[PDB]
From Swiss-Prot:
Chain ranges of the Ig-like domain: 5-100
Task of the protein: Cell adhesion protein. Determines synapse formation. Required for correct localization of syg-1 at synaptic sites.
Annotated tissue distribution: Expressed in vulval epithelial cells.
Entry comment, domain topic: The first five extracellular Ig-like domains are required for correct localization of syg-1.
Species of the source: Caenorhabditis elegans
Cystine pairs: C26-C84
Carbohydrate attachment residues: N65
Record note on quaternary structure: Interacts with syg-1.
Coiled-coil regions listed in the entry: none
Name of the protein: Synaptogenesis protein syg-2
Span of the entire protein shown here: 327 to 429 of 1270
Knockout mutant characteristics: Animals are viable, fertile, egg-laying proficient and coordinated. Abnormal synaptic vesicle clustering in the HSNL motor neuron from larval stage L3 through to adulthood. Reduced accumulation of synaptic vesicle proteins snb-1 and cat-1 in HSNL motor neuron. Defective synapse specificity due to altered distribution of synapses. syg-1 is mis-localized and diffusely distributed on the axon of the HSNL neuron.
Compartments where found: Cell membrane; Synapse
């Protein structure tokens, strides 16, 4: 009856020009109860401004869209490591997405 999200779906630009932002979307796989989306940029948590929840047959999908801005403090070794985590009381799952900053 209750179970954690089995994984997350992570979509977005994989290469962007320095100074621009990448549109990143995270969608949890279905969970019960609903999961909270947390974002991690280069190893540190950042706010989740909004998340949107949908019901499916199994449980609930949580979705969050963010824009990741590339600048001198967010870029490390010419990339940005983005991780999305989906957590409910039964456990959590996560995926990472690497944004390359092109020269
Ligand atoms: C989130 O982004 C996806 C494309 O990556 C888009 O289809 C969807 O409508 C967006 N949702 C919101 C609330 O912006
Ligand atoms: Cl791309």
């Amino acid at each position: 009856v209750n179970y954690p999200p089995a994984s997350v779906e992570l979509f977005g630009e994989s290469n962007i020009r320095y100074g621009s932002s990448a549109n990143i979307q995270c969608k949890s796989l279905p969970s019960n109860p609903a999961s909270q989306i947390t974002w991690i940029i280069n190893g540190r948590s950042v706010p989740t401004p909004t998340q949107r929840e949908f019901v499916v047959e199994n449980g609930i999908v949580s979705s969050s869209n963010v824009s990741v801005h590339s600048n001198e403090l967010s870029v490390e070794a010419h990339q940005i490591n983005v991780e999305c985590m989906a957590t409910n009381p039964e456990g959590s799952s996560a995926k990472q997405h690497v944004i390359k900053i092109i020269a």
